Write a protein that binds this ligand. Structure first.
Ligand SMILES: Cc1cc(S(=O)(=O)N(Cc2cccnc2)[C@H](C)C(=O)NO)ccc1F
Ligand SMILES: [Zn+2]
Length: 486
């Protein structure tokens, strides 16, 4: 367990000694992100904002992560309509987390999804760390050691992660879900600095993935003491093996991976993008030069993001009538619209942030539709709230596109969503709470939810829309009729 520490340490002896006080402080910053302290958030608040914050019920919020919820509760401890307030405040409670910024952006750190000042600080730190990690592990040690990293399955796929652990016995891995996770896991990208161990360490709470990694001779790294290494960012990983193993009467998933040039992985992704486009331009009868599908892939479940795109579009094509699909998609293409499949957060997708300067209006979620760029965005790793799979999410987003085109058809000059018409507003006011809880949010979301359920494989769901929201059901069919006759 400790026999290999010394020789790795001695290899990086001079590197460690020559570290400046700032270089060291930077490595500590990377290991321990800086949380915002409560008292400064509070004193920054005005006394009209303070009074507002404590009267706010907070677990109710739809767009705040459980850590963000808990934090603001502790602010209430010390002290809808104004979602306005929680969206602005959400930005000022993010920890300074270098590795998380790199992962969220996939290395596209110029993405205007955080404030300018911190955005520029992130750049400076990243460039400084890149300069620190100059010494490769080398030929004397690369094949003499293994590097280990424990990982939460939710980091790769939160959808499969919900059922990965056997519900009848939590010491076991669900064999069926295991196969799904392993099936299309061929390669992997690290856009941030992997922090790995020289020897294997016991997994912490809900960590069931245990990586075993072999570096290449040229792979640059730094020693972080206590038998721990930090790897250079932007490295490719080839998955050599995925197996279920048992440690201390508990089942884990071993992932054997080998470091390769990231460019080698990027080449496969680019080849896959050409293939899926040529294949789907033909199926949809689009012009042969159309670029519709785009892979924005930069993270550790890389190969599955690509492979699942094929299946998502297949389910999409299978569950929606052909003529509706063709009409709407050709509308999207006429405005250079894209189907974006990605494993970076959606505010870092150009098809969103280009048309959304306000960060507090920027949205991260499983799926999104942006009318200004006529694009559908689908985020792999995450799990949509009250959503079975990615295909159902994509169908929902396509509902928004249907909404867009239908409204465009009735006035191309003053182009607007059909759900913004007084006609559907009245329908939403009457039937808006008769479907999903989230459908209640607004006209567009109610429309897209209704559209999703009307095209669900569960025929019972389709009948529940016609029975509980017959006016919305009728309205949508009228838009479909309007579209295919256009
Ligand atoms: C139910 C379903 C959900 C999604 S979502 O989670 O990504 N989402 C809705 C959402 C997000 C957070 C909590 N509650 C609902 C985003 C924002 C959206 O509407 N996309 O256009 C996407 C598609 C769906 F069908
Ligand atoms: Zn939506």
């Amino acid at each position: 367990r400790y026999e290999k520490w010394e020789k790795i340490k001695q290899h990086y002896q001079h590197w460690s000694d020559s570290l400046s006080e700032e270089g060291r402080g930077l490595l500590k910053k990377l290991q321990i992100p800086i949380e915002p302290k409560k008292d400064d958030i509070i004193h920054s608040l005005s006394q009209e904002e303070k009074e507002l914050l404590k009267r706010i019920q907070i677990d109710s919020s739809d767009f705040l992560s459980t850590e963000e919820k808990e934090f603001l509760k502790k602010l209430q401890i010390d002290i809808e309509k104004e979602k306005e307030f929680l969206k602005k405040l959400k930005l000022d409670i993010q920890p300074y987390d270098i590795n998380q910024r790199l992962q969220d952006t996939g290395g596209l750190i110029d993405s205007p999804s955080i404030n300018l000042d911190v955005r520029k600080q992130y750049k400076r730190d990243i460039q400084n760390i890149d300069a620190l990690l100059h010494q490769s592990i080398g030929s004397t040690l690369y094949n003499k050691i293994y590097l280990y990293e424990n990982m939460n399955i939710n980091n790769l796929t939160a959808t499969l992660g919900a059922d990965l652990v056997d519900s009848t016995d939590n010491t076991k891995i669900n064999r069926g879900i295991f196969n799904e996770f392993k099936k299309n896991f061929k390669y992997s990208i690290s856009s941030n600095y992997m922090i790995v161990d020289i020897n294997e360490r016991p997994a912490l709470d809900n960590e069931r993935l245990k990586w075993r990694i072999q570096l290449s001779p040229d792979t640059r790294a730094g020693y972080l003491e206590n038998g721990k290494l930090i790897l250079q960012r932007n490295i490719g990983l080839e998955i050599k093996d995925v197996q279920i193993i048992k440690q201390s009467e508990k089942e884990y998933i071993r992932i054997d991976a080998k470091v390769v040039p990231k460019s080698k992985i990027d080449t496969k992704i680019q080849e896959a993008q050409l293939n899926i486009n040529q294949e789907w331009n033909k199926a949809l009868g689009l012009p042969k030069y159309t670029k519709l599908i785009t892979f924005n892939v930069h993270n550790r479940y890389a190969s599955n993001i690509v492979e699942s795109a094929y299946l998502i579009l297949n389910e999409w094509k299978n569950n929606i009538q052909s003529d509706l699909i063709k009409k709407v998609t050709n509308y999207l293409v006429d405005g250079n619209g894209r189907f974006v499949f990605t494993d970076i957060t959606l505010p870092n997708i150009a098809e969103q942030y280009t048309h959304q300067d306000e960060i507090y209006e920027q949205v991260h979620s499983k799926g999104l539709y942006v009318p200004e760029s006529r694009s559908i965005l689908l985020h792999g790793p995450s799990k949509g709230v009250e959503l079975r799979n990615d295909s159902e999410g994509f169908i929902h987003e396509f509902g928004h596109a249907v909404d867009d085109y239908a409204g465009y058809l009735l006035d191309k000059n003053q182009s607007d969503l059909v759900t913004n018409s007084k006609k559907f507003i009245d329908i939403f006011k009457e039937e808006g709470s008769n479907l999903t809880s989230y459908g209640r949010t607004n006209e567009a979301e109610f429309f897209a939810e209704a559209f999703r359920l009307m095209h669900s494989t569960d025929h019972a769901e389709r009948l529940k829309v016609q029975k509980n929201a017959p006016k919305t059901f009728q309205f949508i069919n009228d838009q479909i009729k309007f579209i295919i006759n256009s």
